[PDB]
Structures are given as structure tokens and as C-alpha cells.
């Protein structure tokens, strides 16, 4: 078990034997572009590295096998990364998003630990045996901060230093080592930022840093070298290898570097998701992003109410809490030209339209269970009947309101007609109605019809691309891009009141979150909201978000109130379409290619 050095340079993570020389070759990796930060798990014999050109964090065994991209979403510049080898967690710092995030070595249960008051955090060093994490911030007045490995107890450890890199922990002597890139020095301190000593003051430009036994190894971008020296006096310097320009990270791969123990290593602290280390040598259970910790301090609960705004290449989730949690990009693959989204709160599964692939797809929030429900046919918008478990959606090609089941089997075409172009759709199954836009040439309109295409009337005629609906407020909302404004009305058609119409360029989406009206401006790249109770007024939620496509609010499904709808219990006995009448009973109906039968429930052909 011979100790050796490992360093990243361009697209090569390479190995340099310390004692004598052997295996001075690169680690056989396939798709590396710009390797940066490095760490390892010595018992699993695996290496972990980041990539800026790819915006990824990958892991692979020492022989290049089992190369997998652990983190591949929501990364901008992961210049720092470290491995919790006891709790088996992966920490990293991003200077583009300015946040320190944690997950597992597998990659699941990604959580943001620090996100406030961060100014470009880069170097990262962990100490799970004591429950502390240390990092360096390169922003205005750079500094070195310490926090508990769950994000709490964050203080400033070194305030006077310059831009620090190569933060390395000597666990035996209990000391910190780092390099000052502005004064071009190598310094050390104790675990509290005190007893500060200057290890080396005459080096050209030390950059990366690591420590092993009584020796300190550093890189030099001026001399383009890897050197080592006595960690105490700073002398007995030898050049390990030269002609190495722009070596990003460097470290010693040896078991003695990863010792210690906490409860997370023994039993994962009996936590459901994350086990994070805290002082002193203790632990607390952590949850995925947007998840909350239950009363047992062990299990995590997914968020029940939230927002979902999707752009051309991503689908994101917003959460409103007092701590102002950051938005999360849902790790769903094969997202090309997204145009609409919806969500089923019963099975808790997300649905969306993909225009490029030209299909409607569903998947869980973590990305699992990818299922294609319909696949020429150009779907435009969609809306879910969560009671009949149906999806109503318009087609841009056939110009038709078509309805399909969640399992993919079509119930049939509900609306069709010449000189008709139905685009946006929203369903109100509590009242058995559906509202949609009809963009006829030189004649737009907003129409309502029953969930079977009958009782088709015209609601809004003159003065005019997305509809929102709220039954609690009894209000219908829409937004026009030509006139560039947003309007509201009642479900019956009365009180057509114009909302805030100024400072709007190109509205695309609308939803109702509690007593608020969220809408997205695509060209202005904004997510805003209007207070529905008329108290706080117009407010900007987020600015400069490109390629926006849709937004969808999600309230928690009260299953007690859900089971009360007669359309939900075996579809009210109706094959196909169940309709709710004024009195509250049900009445069956069917698409245009079928006809109701004697039992007033089933349907079929005719002759």
C-alpha cells in the first residue's frame, strides 16, 4: 500500500509515486475535458474530480472502470470539491452560483448547505471526525470561513488573508495549511486561525497544496512545477517534477489521510437521506433540497406545495419558505424545446410537452420512471383532470382537442372543427367545464365548453396564449402577447378586469399560487407575481432567466377532499367522460367517434 501523488492537468488526472518512481502514467479516463478539483475514497479505491468545460463532477475507480457522472445539473464553476469519507458524502463549492452544496457519493439527495453571503468560495477542506468544514472566499476582502458540516455555526476564521487556495488539513498535528495567491506565500495556522506562521515566503507562485507526513507538496504556475518541503521549517525543498503548466489540483492518495469515525460511518445515523457531521464528532440528519425534516429528526418529507417553471432546456422547482431556499433544477434528461408542463399531485408525477421530440412525457421529480404517454401530431398545451385521471391537450397540427389517459391509452377526440385552431387549454373538472383559446385567422377568441366538447359557447370575443384557473377564488386568468397584457375575469364571464398591463413585454405563462398570480415574461426573462388580495401589489420574483416556456403552481392534494369528488371514485361509474351536474351527481359522455348506450355509461360504435 504505497502512498503516491495525484494531480489534475487539462484532461488528465495523473499519478506520481513518492518513494522511488513507478506508474508515472495517467489514470485511464475517457471523457475528461478540464479536470479541476480532486479527492478520493481510499477504502472504495475511487477518485472524484470536477470539470469546468463540462460542468460536471464524476467518479471512477483507480483503473478507470465504472466512470459515472455523479453531478451533472445546476453546475456553473465547481472549482472546489471534497469527500466526506466517513459519512460518505460529497461536498462542493460553486463560484458561478455562489453556493456550497452537499450530496452523497452516489449523488442522490442533493442539498444546498450554504448560499447566503458567499463571494466566490473555492478551496474546500473537510474534517468529519470533528464535524467541521473550512473554505476560502476570493471575493471582496477575501477570507477563510469555517462552518459545521451541515452549514451551521458559520464564522470567519481568517479575515486578513488574500485569495487563498489549496486549503489542506493536517489531522495529526491539527493544523491548517494554505497558499496566499496575492502575497505568493505558504502559510499555516492552528484549527482556530491562531498561531499563524509563514511556512514559505520566497516561492515564485505556489498554487495548489497538500500535506503528507512531515512534507508539504505544492504546485507552482510560475516555475510550472510540483515541489515539496519540510512542513515545519520550510526547507529541504526538492522538485518532484517540472514542465507542468497549470496544474489545477493535487493531493496524496493514502489511507492515513482518511481516518477517524462518526455515527454516520457506522449506521448512517439512522437517517433517511443525509447524515451530516456536526461538533463535536456528532451528527445531524439532513434532507434533500426543498425537503423538510420530520419530528423524529430522522426521516424527510418531500415538499407538498411548490412552483415549477420550465424553460427550453430545463424544468425547475421553486419553494417559498422563511429561509428563502434556492431554486432546484430537476435532473430530467432529454429536455429539448419544452413548451408546457403540468403536475399530477395524486401519484406525485410531473408531466410536460417536448416539441422537438414532439411528445408528452411524464417522470418523477428525481427523474425516475420516464414514460411516454403519446407520440403527425404536434401537441401545444395540456391540462390534467386529476379526478378522471385524464389529460386534455390540443394539437397544433390536427387543430383538435384530444384527450388521453395517464397510461397512454387514448379516450378519443373531444373537440374538432374546420376553421378552428385551439391552443391553450385548462380544465375545471369540479364544475365539469374546460376553457381554451381559439386563434382563428384575423379572429382570436376565448371559449368555454363542457368536458365532452358539448355546450360549446364563446366567452371573450374582441380585444385580443395561456390560461390559469382558480376555483377557490372562482377566477379565470389569461395573458395576451400581442397586446402584451394580462387580464382576469370570473368563471361565468363577468367582471373582465385588466390586471397590471404596463412593464410587460411578452407574457407566456400564468398560474395561481395561494393568493398570488405568477407569470413569466420570456423576452424580458422575468418571473413576477401580483397579489390577489390587493395588499402587497406587484413584485418581482426572479430576474434574467432565459428561454422560459411555462410555469405551473402545485398545491397539496387533500386526499380527504379528493375522495369526495364523485368523478374520482371509479370515474363515477362512467366509461370515459364523467360529468358533474349542478346538483352534484354524475352524467357520462364520450368522444366524437363514440356514442352513449342504453346504460348511460358505456359507449361504442353505431351500425
Amino acid at each position: 500500500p504505497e502512498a503516491f501523488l495525484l494531480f489534475s492537468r487539462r484532461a488528465d488526472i495523473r499519478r506520481i509515486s513518492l518513494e522511488t518512481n513507478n506508474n508515472n502514467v495517467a489514470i485511464p479516463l475517457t471523457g475528461v475535458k478540464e479536470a479541476s478539483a480532486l479527492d478520493f475514497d481510499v477504502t472504495d479505491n475511487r477518485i472524484y474530480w470536477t470539470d469546468i468545460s463540462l460542468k460536471t463532477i464524476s467518479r471512477a475507480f483507480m483503473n478507470g472502470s465504472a466512470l459515472e457522472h455523479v453531478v451533472e445539473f445546476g453546475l456553473d464553476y465547481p472549482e472546489g470539491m471534497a469527500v466526506d469519507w466517513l459519512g460518505k458524502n460529497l461536498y462542493w463549492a460553486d463560484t458561478g452560483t455562489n453556493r456550497i452544496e452537499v450530496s452523497k457519493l452516489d449523488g442522490q439527495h442533493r442539498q444546498v448547505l450554504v448560499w447566503k453571503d458567499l463571494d466566490s468560495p473555492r478551496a474546500l477542506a473537510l474534517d468529519p471526525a470533528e464535524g467541521f468544514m473550512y473554505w476560502t472566499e476570493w471575493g471582496g476582502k477575501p477570507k477563510i470561513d469555517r462552518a459545521a458540516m451541515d452549514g451551521s455555526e458559520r464564522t470567519t476564521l481568517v479575515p486578513n488573508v488574500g485569495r487563498a487556495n489549496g486549503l489542506t488539513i493536517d489531522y495529526a498535528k491539527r493544523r491548517l495549511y494554505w497558499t496566499d495567491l496575492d502575497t505568493n506565500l505558504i502559510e499555516s495556522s492552528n484549527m482556530l486561525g491562531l498561531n499563524r506562521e509563514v511556512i514559505a515566503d520566497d516561492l515564485p507562485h505556489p498554487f495548489g497544496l497538500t500535506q503528507y507526513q512531515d512534507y508539504i507538496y505544492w504546485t507552482d504556475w510560475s516555475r510550472r512545477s510540483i515541489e515539496r518541503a519540510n512542513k515545519t521549517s520550510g526547507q529541504n525543498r526538492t522538485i518532484i517534477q517540472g514542465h507542468l503548466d497549470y496544474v489545477m489540483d493535487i493531493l496524496v492518495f493514502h489511507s492515513s489521510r482518511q481516518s477517524g469515525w462518526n455515527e454516520c460511518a457506522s449506521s448512517n445515523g439512522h437517517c433517511s437521506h443525509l447524515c451530516l457531521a456536526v461538533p463535536v464528532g456528532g451528527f445531524v440528519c439532513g434532507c434533500p433540497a426543498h425537503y423538510s425534516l420530520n419530528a423524529d429528526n430522522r426521516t424527510c418529507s418531500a415538499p407538498t406545495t411548490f412552483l415549477l417553471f420550465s424553460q427550453k432546456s430545463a424544468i425547475n422547482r421553486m419553494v417559498i419558505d422563511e429561509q428563502q431556499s434556492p431554486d432546484i433544477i430537476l435532473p430530467i434528461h432529454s429536455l429539448r424545446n419544452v413548451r408546457a408542463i403540468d403536475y399530477d399531485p395524486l401519484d406525485k408525477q410531473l408531466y410536460w410537452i417536448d416539441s422537438r421530440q414532439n411528445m408528452i412525457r411524464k417522470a418523477q421529480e428525481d427523474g425516475s420512471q420516464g414514460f411516454t404517454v403519446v407520440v403527425e401530431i404536434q401537441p401545444y398545451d395540456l391540462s390534467i383532470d386529476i379526478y378522471s385521471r385524464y389529460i386534455y391537450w390540443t394539437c397544433e397540427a390536427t387543430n383538435v382537442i384530444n384527450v388521453t389517459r395517464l397510461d397512454g391509452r387514448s379516450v378519443g377526440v373531444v373537440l374538432k372543427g374546420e376553421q378552428d385552431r385551439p391552443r391553450a387549454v385548462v380544465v375545471n373538472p369540479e364544475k365539469g367545464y374546460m376553457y381554451f383559446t381559439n386563434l382563428q385567422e384575423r379572429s382570436p377568441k376565448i371559449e368555454r365548453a363542457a368536458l365532452d366538447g358539448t355546450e360549446r359557447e364563446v366567452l371573450f370575443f374582441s380585444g385580443l396564449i395561456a390560461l390559469a384557473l382558480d376555483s377557490r377564488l372562482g377566477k379565470l386568468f389569461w395573458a395576451d402577447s400581442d397586446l402584451r397584457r394580462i387580464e382576469s375575469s370570473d368563471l361565468s364571464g363577468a367582471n373582465r378586469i385588466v390586471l397590471e398591463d404596463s412593464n410587460i413585454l411578452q407574457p407566456v405563462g400564468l398560474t395561481v399560487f395561494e393568493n398570488w398570480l405568477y407569470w413569466i415574461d420570456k423576452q424580458q426573462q422575468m418571473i413576477e407575481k401580483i397579489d390577489m388580495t390587493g395588499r402587497e401589489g406587484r413584485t418581482k420574483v426572479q430576474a434574467r432567466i432565459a428561454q422560459l416556456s411555462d410555469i405551473h403552481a402545485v398545491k397539496e392534494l387533500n386526499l380527504q377532499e379528493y375522495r369526495q369528488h364523485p368523478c374520482a371514485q371509479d370515474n363515477g361509474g362512467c366509461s370515459h367522460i364523467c360529468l358533474v351536474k349542478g346538483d352534484g351527481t354524475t352524467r357520462c359522455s364520450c368522444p366524437m367517434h363514440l356514442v352513449l348506450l342504453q346504460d348511460e355509461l358505456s359507449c361504442g360504435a353505431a351500425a
Partner: nanobody
Framework: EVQLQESGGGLVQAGGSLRLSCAAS????????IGWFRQAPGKEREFVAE????????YYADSVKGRFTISRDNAKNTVYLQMNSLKPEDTAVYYC????????????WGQGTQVTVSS
Amino acid sequence: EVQLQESGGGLVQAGGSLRLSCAASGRTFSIYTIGWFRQAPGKEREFVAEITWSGGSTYYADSVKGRFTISRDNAKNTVYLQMNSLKPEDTAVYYCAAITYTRGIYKYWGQGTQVTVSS
């Protein structure tokens, strides 16, 4: 990513002086060094001088050593090249170049400024 904007420079008599400026915008916290290059109408790119982003280290080529003085502003994100004892051999287009700790060798370039020395 970093964007550089060169400014200053023009028609200057022989034996005079002229101060060049280079404004860095973007991820300037990640800047390692800033180097000045120049392109003559005949010769190709020539390396002139470099300075670390903290101003602690500096390097001048022997072609301009003793005359030119590369520096960084005391606050702003700009670097200056003070050119003294100008010769007709210095007539060229001067380029600012940034090398960052992130992305490493990837050089972010500016558009450069034209400098002419008449005699």
C-alpha cells in the same frame, strides 16, 4: 469567463510617452495574470510584459525593459502600460491578455489599440 477592453493609444511623436489601459470585467476574482502583446504589420504577436492580478510580480521583455512599466490600478479592475522613450520600432497594435486560475491556459483576449510612432 472574462472580457477585456483596451483603451488609450494613438499617434505619438518619437521619443515621447503614452499610457495604455485595459479594463477587465467578469470573473476578475479568478484572474491569475494580465499580459500585454503587440502585433506589428510584418512581425507576428510579440510578448511585452505581464503582471499578476495582485501586482506583486512583474515581467518585462528585454525589448522594452527599462522603458515600459506595467502596473495595476490601486482600486479599479484595470491595468496600465506606461510606455516611455517611444521608437518607430514600437508601432503596432497592442493586445491585453488574461489567464485565469479557472480554465487555466485558456487566454481571454481583447481587441487591442493601435499605436503609431512617427519620426
